Every structure is written in C-alpha cells, then in structure tokens.
UniProtKB/TrEMBL annotation, chain E:
Keywords: Acetylation, ATP-binding, Coiled coil, Cytoplasm, Metal-binding, Nucleotide-binding, Nucleus, Proteasome. It comes from the Eukaryota. Its main location: cytoplasm. It is found in: Cytoplasm; Nucleus. GO terms for cellular component: cytoplasm; nucleus; proteasome complex. This is 26S proteasome regulatory subunit 10B. One of its GO terms (molecular function) is ATP hydrolysis activity. Belongs to the AAA ATPase family.
Length: 282, 191, 70, 286, 83
C-alpha cells in the first residue's frame, strides 16, 4: 500500500453540473456528491454528479438511497467516489470543516476525493477547478507518496499561494485532473455554433448596408482630419514621451485601420452572396 | 416469502358488464384482487404488484409496486367498457416486467378474463415459447364468458410450460366468485 | 494564442474589486490613484485598457488585494 | 403557439450519457427521458432533462413503457432541488422519429400543456444542426380523417449562459477554432449552406423519382405545394434587374476602393518609419 | 429547557451583514454600492433578488465576506426621531 501519481478522470456532464450548481448558489458554499468509478489503485474516474438541499449540513439521506436507487434502475448502478462544493471567490482551499468531513469520508472509502470549485475566478476561457485528497498527520515525518514518476511532481503545475497558505502539502495532498471525451459527445460538441444555409445565404440589406457605409465613411473622414495634423505634427520628443502624451484622447492611426477593415468585410461578403444567389439560382 | 412480481390483467371490457356472477363481475374480479393482494402481502412484503387492463390502450394504472393500497384505489371506477383484448394484454404484461428494478423477483402474472376472446393457437404457442424464454409462469383465473371451455388458454399454458413444466395454470369461469383461497388450497404458494 | 491570452486575463476582475478614482500616471503602464478608502496609492495598469479613457480623474476599479487599475 | 425554443448544451449531453447507459444492447434500445424547460414566453426555454425506463418491441409498435412512478419520484427530487425547473416535454434518441412517437406525446400531454418531443441524433452524419423537436396537432383533412393528427416542426436553437460558456469553451481548447477569423467564417457559411441545398435537393429527388414511378403514394399532400415552390423561381437576368446590380455593386466597390486606398498609404508609413531607424541606428553604430 | 438550548444552538451560526445603498446598476449582475461609513464597491445579487426593485438610492444588505447584495430593505430610522 502506497500512493502513486494518480489521475482524476472526469465526465463532461460533471463539469457543467459543477459550474451551474455553484453559480446558481454563488453567494455561499454549495455542496454536492461526486459519483464515479474506482478504475484502479492509480487513477480514478467520475461519471455522474448531483447535489442535494442545504439551508454546511446536508439534510435527510432518504434522498440519498432513493436517488442512487433510481439512478441504478434507470441507466445502471455505479459507485460513489468523492464529492464537491464551492469556495466562491476563495483560495479554493479545504476549509476547516471541509477537512472535517474528510476523516469522515476516507474512513468510509479509501480514495475519497474532495472537489473544490469556484464559478467566480473562472473566466470564459478557463475555469478554476480544483480537488484535494486528505493526508494523515501521524505520518508527518514518514514519507507519504513514493514518487515513482514525474507526473504528479515535476510534470504538473505549481501550488498557488492563497491555498498553500492553508495546506499546500499539509493535511492533504493535491491531485491531477484531466478530461476524457467520448467521440459521440465529441462530434456534436464540435458543432454547436453553426447555422443552416439560410444564414449563409442571407443578404442583410442594401438600405441599411449603404446607410451603414455612408455612416462609417463620414466619421472616417474626420479620423483622416485628425490623422493629417497628428502625423505631420511630430514633436521631436523621443519615441516614448509620445507614448506618454498619447494617453488622453489621442487616437489617429488606430481607428483608421479599423473602419477600413469593417468596411472591407461588409462590402466583400455583401457582394459575394449576391453573386452566388444569381449564378446558382435560375 | 418467495420473490416475485405479480402482474394482474384486469378486464374493463364491455362483456364484464353483466351478472353471471352474483352482484357483478366488477365486484367479483375486484374481490379476487382483494384476495390476491392480501395473498402476496402475507407471503412477502418484498414482492410487488402491478396491474394492467385489456382495453383499447391497455393501461399501467399502477407500476409494479409492493404496496397494494394504490391498486385498491385504482380498482374503483374501473369503467368496464370496451372490448376484451388478449394478445396485447399478455404482451403489455410481457415487455413491462423487463423494467424491473429487482431481478430476483420471479415474473408472475394473473389474469381476470371475462369476455369472449378471439385468439389463435399459433399465437398462444408463439407467446407461450416467448414466455418460455423468460419463464413467466402465468395463472389466469377466468371471470365470466372467456372462450369455449377456456380454449386456447390451457393450450397456451401447456405450450408455455411444455415438457413437464406445470408452472402456469388456467382456472375456470362458469359458476361465480370462486374463493381463490379455495382455488389455491394446494397451490397456495404457486397456483 | 494571443487572443486566448487576452481572455484569460479577464479572471482578475470577478466583480468585487473596489470603486476608486484615477488620479495621474507617472509613465507607461503605471499611474497613481486615490481610492475612496481615503488614502492614495501608486499602482500599475493593465495593457488592455485604452489610453483614451483618461483625463479628469475618471471613476476606476481596483483590486482588493493587489489594488491595481483593472 | 411556442414558435421556437432555446435548448442549453447541458441537455444534448445529459441524453448522450444515458444513450451510453443502455448503449450496451447495441441493436436497438430507444432512449427516452423527460424534458425540462421554462414557461418563458410564446418562445419557450429548455434547461434540464432526465431519463426514465423505456422499452419497446420490434413488431406492432404499441408496446412501450414509461415508468410513471420513476417519473413522479425523480421529478419530485428535481422539484425539491429546483422549483425554478419544471417539466416541459420529452425526447428520444431516434435518428428518424417513429410512427409510435405520437402515442408518447399523446400520453404525457397531461403533465405539460403540450409535452413537446425532442429528436436528438447521436450520429448526425449531416454536418448541419441536429436535435430538432416537434409538437403534435390535429389537421383534419378534406379526405374525411376523423382526426388528422401529426407533429409540427418548430424552430429551435442552442441556449447559452455565462458559466456554461465558460466551462464549455474552456473545453473547446482541445481543438482549434477560428471564430474571430475575419472573412473566413462567412466563406465557411456559404459553403455549408450550399452543402445543405445540395443535400435537400438530392433528398427531394430521391423521394420524387420513387413516387413518380413504381411504388409510392401519389397523395395531394405536397405534389402541388412544392409546385408553388417552382412558382417563385425569380428570373434573374431580365431587363431592369441589371440596374439592380450595377447601381449598387459599384457603390460597394467604391467603398472598398477607398479602403484599399488608405490601407496602402498606412502600409507605406512603416517603410519610412523603419528605413529611418535602421540606417540612422547603423550610421551611429559605426 | 432543552428546546431553548437547541434554539441557541441554531442561533449560534448566524453572522450579520453590511448595510449599504444602491448607487447605480452597471449591468444585470454588476452594481455600484457604497458602504454607509465610506468607500464603494462593485457587487452582484444572488439569483432571485427581483433586481427591478433595486433603484439608485435604495438600501440593501450585503454579505460580509462574499460582499454581495442579499436583502434590500426599507428606509432608515433616524434616532433623533423615534425618541
Ligand atoms: Zn470551503
């Protein structure tokens, strides 16, 4: 018996169920169960996620047994592997009671996993997901992980400061997480932002189109007005004092490319679709 | 104490609307439901009861469940109107019991048939061997005019438990509200 | 990759920042702001902000911990 | 009327997982679950969904089972956990909807005012928009149909939310994507559009040759309605329509001309800018 | 008496809140508020505060730690008046 370089296998539904639950209960720690499968001594796999009511102490486990039952009879039976909750705008660190449920859980199952989530620090590009694993204190001097591979040591990331200020190595150990993707969900997830041929065959309008070009050309004239004075101006001031006196209201040479780009991309497609609609049709 | 799942096929067809039984076939088959639900109740609370009709759109009024009070609530205002339908009754009772959460329970079925059926013996042999695959021993207690001496039903049963199976059985429908405790005096555990 | 870079910077705000006021800038990407917390500070700025939004002490936001013009 | 619906990306995955659940049978086991949505407007919103046990034989498609008990308990749990959510309809993983599919809606029209169906496609070989939904009506016909009952196509779309866009689009990093690709998404658009046109034409001609000869019903269903489709067919090249093009196309050509005009000069500035710094730093370097 | 003890048990874990006013609604979830004792902040409601009722000048209750709007309340109580 010894630790390893463990891996956290996920379920794509699990992530969304996380973020929607925590976001909906954003002003407080929202709790829930992590349901999955113990694939081996090395890696874990979560496939199902769900939560319960909380007014953090969960109420009647009669929801528990009936929930897992009806989840077994429809679909199949599975195994509870861990759990999760939120640290809204927090250091995604196991709170004092959060660790207090951990001696409760690891005593039940060995590889009981805590799951920290914050729907606050997560930007649309990247989410701040987290999960931890309690460690004993009796072995505070004795080694805890054999470290037989670089992956969970010098191959992952670097512990953050706001959670290292709480445990960072102590009272628990971090764990790596990845994403397994079925090809079935993968293909449909690939395509969810395309439209039908109607969109690709629309001709927006030439009254508001020509009205629009008539718009942008107008102020673009003024942008050229400013651009003449600015470019010819050229105080011999060194290439950085210009970069300190340009903060303000100064903006030639910037809008000029922009309006040209937009006026390009409009007129181009606007002509092209009209072309196709006549070549192809009749 | 045995594990099973009772599936009853009540008859709300038109031909149940008569008095070959003393009060009415509705009260007769209803009371037989009273004795079957108490029977399985006293046998094993783990066992579960589900009912089905034989009307145009044969209905699962109660999903297979150990409680019987719901079935008793369903028995009232049963509205025995329509036409007796058999081959789709054993079918809807057939594909239903594969939706069971508990699989140790043996798929059992009892049917209350009290209207003239129009089935075929090749149909009862196909359905019979189909009931050989899952071994759904069904004991039907007929309540009213069913067929010529319950023909195509002892053939259905024997073609169900062929080669000395004797698990399914066929009752009779000529005198009245047979005390099913007397009908299953010896076959009290398995009719 | 650069466009992926701009979006990932966005996590810094997350809303609860502070309401302060821009005061002045010393040089490129570093300025001074007097917060509504009564005190005044010397801070850096994000490269995302357009430099045309300055002048006459604009209403600005700042990080709680860092206290940077975001 | 509902006239359109907004389905979120959670569902269309919370169905795929369950098709995966009983997906071991392989041959055929139609996945049916409960659809959950919002009484938003005439337009309707769809947020949640869950499953329910369902089986059906091969012949005589009248033998199918939806556990009303399981539906009652599990939706009781989903109401206890979310009163904001509520039942709106249902779905099935059928690539093409079946003749049996009307009896299901007709069954559970008692829970929802109209339990709208939802057809999803696990394998949308078509690269268009999958997972379209219908809502049944009655269209009793001159023929003498006692109840001409058939579903109705209703436009739908994919929902969106701040958090779910976050988590999903962070998951989209596994593949490359040019969503900011200037004047590229358009070209892709007309490509996939014309592809849909050709697919539809090949389909309608497949049907049309079949009905034309040998064996197919020759009903008055479409046969002249699609003729009226031929009725429009604008005769592009004619007298004054030329004045439609040449009086505007050159207009947009003028704007494009000016844009290139300034773009060239702007590009020309950097030549002086760097040709100054190069040699001026060189001569001072030496 | 055991019932009273349970009452205090439940009463133990209730933390107060900050009192402030709503300056202006920046967006659907971005709000500009000011503490009564000084500076201002940018906050958000929870999900179901009925944000239509929030207007410039109203008074609201904020979370101490998360610092978000919870339970917008009526006008204030001016202790030179109740006496
Ligand atoms: Zn916590």
């Amino acid at each position: 018996a010894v630790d390893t370089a463990e891996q956290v296998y996920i379920s794509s539904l699990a992530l969304l169920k996380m973020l929607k639950h925590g976001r909906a209960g954003v002003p407080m720690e929202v709790m829930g169960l992590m349901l999955g499968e113990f694939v081996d001594d090395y890696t874990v796999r979560v496939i199902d996620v769900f939560a319960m009511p909380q007014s953090v102490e969960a109420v009647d486990p009669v929801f528990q047994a009936k929930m897992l039952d009806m989840l077994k009879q429809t679909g199949r039976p599975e195994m509870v592997v861990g759990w999760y909750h939120s640290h809204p705008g927090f250091g995604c660190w196991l709170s004092g009671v959060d660790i207090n449920t951990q001696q409760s859980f690891e005593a039940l199952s060995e590889r009981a996993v805590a799951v920290v989530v914050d729907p606050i620090q997560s930007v649309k590009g990247k989410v701040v997901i987290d999960a931890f694993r309690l460690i004993n204190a009796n072995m505070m001097v004795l080694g805890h992980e054999p470290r037989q591979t670089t992956s969970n040591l010098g191959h992952l990331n670097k512990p953050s400061i706001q959670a290292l200020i709480h445990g960072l190595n102590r009272h628990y150990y971090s764990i790596t997480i990845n994403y397994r993707k079925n090809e079935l969900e993968q293909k449909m997830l690939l395509n969810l932002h395309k439209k039908s041929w109607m969109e690709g065959l629309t001709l927006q309008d030439y009254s508001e189109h020509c009205k629009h070009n008539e718009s942008v050309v107008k102020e673009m004239l003024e942008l050229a007005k400013n651009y003449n004075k600015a470019v010819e101006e050229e105080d011999k001031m060194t290439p950085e004092q210009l970069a300190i006196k340009n903060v303000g209201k100064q903006d030639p040479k910037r809008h000029l490319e922009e309006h040209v780009d937009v006026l390009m991309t409009s007129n181009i497609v606007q002509c092209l679709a009209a072309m196709l609609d006549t070549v192809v049709f009749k | 104490m045995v594990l099973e799942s009772t599936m009853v096929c009540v008859d709300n067809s038109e031909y149940m609307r008569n008095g070959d039984f003393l009060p009415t076939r509705l009260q007769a088959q209803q009371d037989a439901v009273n004795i079957v639900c108490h029977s399985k109740t006293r046998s094993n609370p783990e066992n579960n009861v589900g009912l089905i009709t034989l009307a145009n759109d044969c209905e699962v009024l109660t999903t297979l469940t150990p409680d019987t009070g719901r079935i008793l609530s369903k028995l009232h205002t049963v509205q025995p109107k329509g036409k007796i339908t058999f081959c789709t009754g054993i079918r809807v009772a057939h594909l239903a019991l594969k939706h069971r959460q508990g699989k140790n329970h043996k798929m059992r079925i009892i049917a209350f048939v009290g209207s003239p059926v129009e089935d075929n013996e090749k149909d009862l042999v196909k359905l019979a061997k189909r009931l050989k695959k899952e071994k759904v021993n069904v004991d039907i207690i007929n309540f009213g005019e069913e067929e010529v001496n319950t023909e195509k039903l002892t053939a259905f049963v024997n073609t169900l438990n062929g080669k000395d199976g004797t698990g399914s059985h066929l009752v009779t429908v000529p005198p009245g509200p047979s005390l099913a405790d007397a009908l299953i005096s010896s076959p009290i555990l398995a009719g | 990759e650069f466009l992926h870079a701009q979006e990932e910077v966005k996590r810094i705000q997350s809303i609860p920042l502070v309401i302060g006021q821009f005061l002045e800038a010393v040089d490129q990407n570093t300025a001074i702001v007097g917060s509504t917390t009564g005190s005044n500070y010397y801070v850096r700025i994000l490269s995302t902000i357009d430099r045309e939004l300055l002048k006459p002490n604009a209403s600005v936001a700042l990080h709680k911990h860092s206290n940077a013009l975001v | 009327a509902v006239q359109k619906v907004v389905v979120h990306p959670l569902v269309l995955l919370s169905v795929v997982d369950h098709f995966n659940r009983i997906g071991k049978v392989g041959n055929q086991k139609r996945v049916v679950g409960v659809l959950l949505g919002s009484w938003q407007k005439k337009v309707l919103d769809v947020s949640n969904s869950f499953a329910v046990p369902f089986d059906e034989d091969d012949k005589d498609d009248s033998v199918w089972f939806l556990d009303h008990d399981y539906l009652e308990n599990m939706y009781g749990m989903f109401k206890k956990v979310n009163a904001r959510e509520r039942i709106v309809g249902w779905y099935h993983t059928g690539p093409k909807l079946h003749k049996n599919d009307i009896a299901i809606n007709e069954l559970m029209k008692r829970y929802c005012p109209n339990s709208v169906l939802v057809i999803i496609d696990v394998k949308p070989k078509d690269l268009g928009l999958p997972t379209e939904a219908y809502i049944s009506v009655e269209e009793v016909h001159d023929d003498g149909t006692p109840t001409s009952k058939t579903f109705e196509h209703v436009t739908s779309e994919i929902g969106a939310e701040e958090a779910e866009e976050v988590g999903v689009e962070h998951l989209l990093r596994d593949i490359k994507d040019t969503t900011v690709g200037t004047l590229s998404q358009r070209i892709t658009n007309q490509v996939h559009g014309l592809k849909g046109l050709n697919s539809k034409l090949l389909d309608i001609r497949s049907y049309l040759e079949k009905v034309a000869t040998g064996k197919l019903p020759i009903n008055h269903q479409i046969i002249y309605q699609l003729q009226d489709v031929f009725n429009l067919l604008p005769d592009v090249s004619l007298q004054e329509f030329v004045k439609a093009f040449y009086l505007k196309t050159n207009d947009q050509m003028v704007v494009v001309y000016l844009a290139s005009l300034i773009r060239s000069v702007v590009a020309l500035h950097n030549l002086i800018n760097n040709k100054i710094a190069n040699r001026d730093a060189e001569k001072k370097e030496g | 008496q055991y019932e009273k003890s349970e009452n205090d048990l439940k009463a133990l874990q209730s933390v107060g809140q900050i009192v402030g006013e709503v300056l202006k609604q920046l967006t659907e979830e971005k709000f500009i508020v000011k503490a009564t004792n000084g500076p201002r902040y940018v906050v958000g409601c929870r999900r179901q505060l009925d944000k239509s009722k929030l207007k410039p000048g109203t008074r609201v209750a904020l979370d101490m730690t998360t610092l978000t709007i919870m339970r917008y309340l009526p006008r204030e109580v001016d202790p030179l008046v109740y006496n």
